[PDB]
């Protein structure tokens, strides 16, 4: 089950 | 950085002339990920060769398994030919059924 996070940018 | 691939060529099961098996070429420890790998039969490129999906080790280096069904004989020679940016020319590793 993948981790869901929104608009994670470096 | 650049890291040249390790190469192992081997069968899934111990080889028995006349018996269906799988011929594997495992390439690992390389970076970057672009790599060319062919399985050879008596010097010639084998056509239907499958491979695993790109993954990597704890040190970030990549590994891939290339494989094909084959039926080994006494006379036939098999090999794996690998090209990578770290290699001035393609590296050929012969299948030795005792390795």
């Amino acid at each position: 089950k993948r981790w869901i996070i929104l608009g994670l940018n470096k | 950085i650049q890291r040249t691939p390790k190469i192992q060529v081997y069968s899934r099961h111990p080889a028995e002339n006349g018996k269906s098996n799988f011929l594997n070429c495992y390439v690992s420890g390389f970076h970057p990920s672009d790599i060319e790998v062919d399985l050879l039969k008596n010097g010639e490129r084998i056509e239907k060769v499958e491979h695993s999906d790109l993954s990597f080790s704890k040190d970030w280096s990549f590994y891939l398994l290339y494989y094909t069904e084959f039926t080994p004989t006494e006379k036939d020679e098999y090999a794996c030919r690998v090209n990578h940016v770290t290699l001035s020319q393609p590296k050929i590793v012969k299948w030795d059924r005792d390795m």
Binding site: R2, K10 | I1, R12, D53, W60, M99
Partner: protein, 276 residues
């Protein structure tokens, strides 16, 4: 005993040859169970183990959506890192990410992970505390400041302590036939003459799962660490793994050499000798 779940992601830019290629795979222990490849004709998350096939359409749609989203964020990040490192748009670059959790026999979280590399080098990693970051350089420090501002670690910790462990436990139960079975190595010792004066002793381990294994040669009871050729553990292609260890031994002295094999599938470590 203990178990792990890991997701791996690789994005590789290819200027002049379209958008970066994105490949992600998921594992429980040493078993591949899902994959996504941006270059597939109609890219979706696909099952690679029987026990995940039972998950429904909602599961597959969501996992597909997440993979596609990661491909997109990576594409953005590759552009961003060209700026951070003052690099031209001409070359190929690589972003890698791994994250996941380890659990003990009782299913409790042992450790969580989330780490990233750029061009094969450590970039930024979540520390074992699941609350702070280690940045490898001044570029990664920029990401660290952004991620601190966005409270990433807090959300990550919540996933690692929560869904990561709960779904790992679910997969272990559903796939218990294979995931909770260790296959011990089949072992033999072969002898390969080199010259009149010496021969190779090769200790084999075949058909084992999981991959973790120890093969060692002893001479008169002393580990032959410096003189052993130990190949990398390699996949057979049918779930199992293979490995061998070799020593060059003076003809006549074959009996002073012992091969020792440790694997979780063995109740006791094995001691082998060349017999013929």
């Amino acid at each position: 005993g203990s178990h792990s779940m890991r997701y791996f992601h690789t994005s590789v830019s290819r200027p002049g040859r379209g958008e970066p290629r994105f490949i992600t795979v998921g594992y429980v222990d040493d078993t591949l169970f899902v994959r996504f490849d941006s270059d597939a004709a109609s890219p979706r998350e696909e099952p690679r183990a029987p026990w995940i096939e039972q998950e429904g359409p909602e599961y597959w749609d969501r996992e597909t959506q997440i993979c596609k989203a990661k491909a997109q964020t990576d594409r953005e990040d590759l552009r961003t890192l060209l700026r951070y490192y003052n690099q031209s748009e001409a070359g190929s670059h690589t972003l890698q990410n791994m994250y996941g959790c380890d659990v003990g026999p009782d299913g409790r979280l042992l450790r969580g992970y989330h780490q990233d590399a750029y061009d094969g080098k450590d970039y930024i990693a979540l520390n074992e505390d699941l609350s702070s970051w280690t940045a490898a350089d001044t570029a990664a420090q920029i990401t660290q400041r952004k991620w601190e501002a966005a409270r990433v670690a807090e959300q990550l910790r919540a996933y690692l302590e929560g869904e990561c462990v709960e779904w790992l436990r679910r997969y272990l139960e559903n796939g218990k036939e294979t995931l909770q079975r260790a296959d011990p190595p089949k072992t033999h010792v072969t002898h390969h003459p080199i010259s009149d004066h010496e021969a190779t002793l090769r200790c084999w381990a075949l058909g084992f799962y999981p991959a973790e294994i120890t093969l060692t040669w002893q001479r008169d009871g002393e580990d032959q660490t410096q003189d052993t050729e130990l190949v990398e553990t390699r996949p057979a292609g049918d779930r199992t793994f293979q490995k061998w260890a070799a020593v060059v031994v003076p003809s006549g002295e074959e009996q002073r050499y012992t091969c020792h094999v440790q694997h979780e599938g063995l109740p006791k470590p094995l001691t082998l000798r060349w017999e013929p």
